[PDB]
Amino acid sequence: MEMEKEFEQIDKSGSWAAIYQDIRHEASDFPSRVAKLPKNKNRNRYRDVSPFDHSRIKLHQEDNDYINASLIKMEEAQRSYILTQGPLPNTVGHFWEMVWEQKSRGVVMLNRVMEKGSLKCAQYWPQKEEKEMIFEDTNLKLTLISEDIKSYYTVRQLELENLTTQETREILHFHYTTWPDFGVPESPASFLNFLFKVRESGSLSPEHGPVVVHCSAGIGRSGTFCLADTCLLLMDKRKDPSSVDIKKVLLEMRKFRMGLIQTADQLRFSYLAVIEGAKFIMGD
Structure with a gap:
């Protein structure tokens, strides 16, 4: 479904909060054991925002290799980001x-x-x-x-x-x-x-x-930036640009860092940014 029509449908039915909660429910849950060790408490700005163990960036020091930072690797788009x-x-x-x-x-x-x-x-x-x-x-x-x-x-x-x-x-x-x-x-x-x-x-x-x-926190505004960039790159790369599904891309990114896109307003704005940005990518 062309996201521009999906957008109007959600907007007229005022169902952004419902879409967004669906994303929260389906999002991956992976362990964050290193982030929760007592020695790392003062390295986290927010108790409830932690990097997953599998994607965390490790500092090259034997001492304490922990930083609150995640590697987001987007395979089809061939883009990588560190969110921190x-x-x-x-x-x-x-x-x-x-x-x-x-x-x-x-x-x-x-x-x-x-x-x-x-x-x-x-x-x-x-x-x-x-x-x-x-x-x-x-x-x-x-x-x-x-x-x-x-x-x-x-x-x-x-x-x-x-x-x-x-x-x-x-x-x-x-x-x-x-x-x-x-x-x-x-x-x-x-x-x-x-x-x-x-x-x-x-x-x-x-x-x-x-x-x-x-x-x-490295999840809200930061999530919006990488979601918009990756969606626009995919619309450029694919045969069929209307096949790009912003919700599927967001769930893929949430395999690598929790909580990306913090509100239903941020979700709506991400749609708006990709729709308007496409009118440069697609040779408009």
């Missing part, structure tokens, strides 16, 4: 260790540091060129190289140095700055423009490690 929580004051070093070890080229951030009067993640990158950051626990240095502030997003060039070997890599930071504190955007236009800026950067190409994408 916003870093905590005590996990900023782990975050940049993961970027280094997984060979990522881009980081996508979908939240502001403060929302609704509370901190939603640590200030984990430098705000001035001349004030670099050193992470002593993981032996990394991070420098702001350039910053381009736009109306709906900011792009930064960062340099990450492994102080142990003195290799350096350029990391691109894509920061969507205008998602509202409550609810979802009224139009998907600025979110789609942002998605295509990330694509155009080369950060998603298979020559690099997986892009790292985060919000506060």
Whole structure:
């Protein structure tokens, strides 16, 4: 069923909450034993959001290899993503260790540091060129190289140095700055423009490690970003684009990280974004 007609049907019958609960009921359940060990309690921002054991990213250190981060591997689309929580004051070093070890080229951030009067993640990158950051626990240095502030997003060039070997890599930071504190955007236009800026950067190409994408918990806004990107790529790749079923793609992604798409409003917005984005993919 063409998702645009599926969309109108759900919209007129006002059944988004019912569709979304069906997804919650059918979603995979896998163990998250490492995330729940007592030693890792202060490495999780939210008690109820954990990576599955089978897909968790492991830090390359014998000490404690745990970070709240998951590898989402989309086989048909040939896209991979790492979805993670916003870093905590005590996990900023782990975050940049993961970027280094997984060979990522881009980081996508979908939240502001403060929302609704509370901190939603640590200030984990430098705000001035001349004030670099050193992470002593993981032996990394991070420098702001350039910053381009736009109306709906900011792009930064960062340099990450492994102080142990003195290799350096350029990391691109894509920061969507205008998602509202409550609810979802009224139009998907600025979110789609942002998605295509990330694509155009080369950060998603298979020559690099997986892009790292985060919000506060790493499941809601972050889920919307990867769901829209994967659905649009499949519509480009297949004989028959109308065969792409957004609910089936979402359940496949939920095999790799729990709770992706947190509300029925986020589900509806994901449909809207894919429908409007198709009117570029399909040669409109």
